[PDB]
Design a protein around this ligand. Sequence first.
Ligand code: B3N
Ligand code: NA
Ligand code: NA
Ligand code: ZN
Length: 357
Amino acid sequence: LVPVYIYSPEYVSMCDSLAKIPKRASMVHSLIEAYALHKQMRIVKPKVASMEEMATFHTDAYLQHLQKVSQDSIEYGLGYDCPATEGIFDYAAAIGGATITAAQCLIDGMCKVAINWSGGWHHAKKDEASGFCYLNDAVLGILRLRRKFERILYVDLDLHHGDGVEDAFSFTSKVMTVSLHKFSPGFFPGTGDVSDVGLGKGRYYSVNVPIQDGIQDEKYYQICESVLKEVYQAFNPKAVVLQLGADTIAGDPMCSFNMTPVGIGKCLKYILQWQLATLILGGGGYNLANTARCWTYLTGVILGKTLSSEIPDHEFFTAYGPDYVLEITPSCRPDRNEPHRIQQILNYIKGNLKHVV
Ligand SMILES: CN(C)c1ccc(C(=O)NCCCCCCC(=O)NO)cc1
Ligand code: NA
Ligand code: NA
Ligand SMILES: [Zn+2]
């Protein structure tokens, strides 16, 4: 009944090759390994996603294109955010396979929790790489979980709107998506206002919480709990997919939100308490050490352990300087979230939730 840890050196190596975030998978894994948390989980080597498996969501023209490029590209969303570099198809196939493997562990009852810290690439569209995402692994995970579990809840706590996942499932009532994100014109991807609720038979089954710069642990949790509690009771999910992108975290060069891993960990504890099949994904996170600190810490809460404050010696110890501690401060900058507007967001959501289900 011990949590599944998707991990292999091939896999971490493949994920270290993402141009946007070099060496990040290693640092995350290395910190986890340094805390010996992998000794407390069941290490599962990820499958490589076969063509037909990624075909469950991505159109075949796209998939076949990635393959050749890996060996009109502006049409398939490739370019600046998504380079056509030697091996990107193997990259996508590894990330997608990893999330699929996590979900497959879940549906097989191998574990209550399965973790793929290298996943969470929530922007990719069916025929279109986007926002560093070549392949929407969260979508393929949800789709795999759907083979056994009737209703899936996707909760996305990344800084950016989980548009690709929302889009994938916006028409159905069987998957509800809940996104907490910066919403400010010009800030990627620009979608996901509170009024975005899903479409057709999927109407009211998309939830969006547009937040502004400076949010801290206390208030983010207040909001997240308020939305989740109402979501749980109305939707009654059978399994949960949870994206925990660390770009919300104090010290991220995106410098938008002002979270510490402790406040995100509260939200996680709240989801874990539902005691449901839960697929844990990573995502954004551009301060590499802090991201490692964050997910290592969340791995701690999954296991129900509290970790030493001192960063253990390991491959990447020097990146943790000068303090070499697990915890995060809080930059001192204003909380641009007027509590009036948060209450209008919260009400509007609760109103939408009364139509579920
Ligand atoms: C300094 N530098 C080289 C860059 C700075 C910002 C971006 C960017 O935000 N691009 C837009 C795509 C943002 C999505 C990031 C993926 C994510 O975290 N999803 O949640 C790119 C490059
Ligand atoms: Na999000
Ligand atoms: Na939906
Ligand atoms: Zn992000």
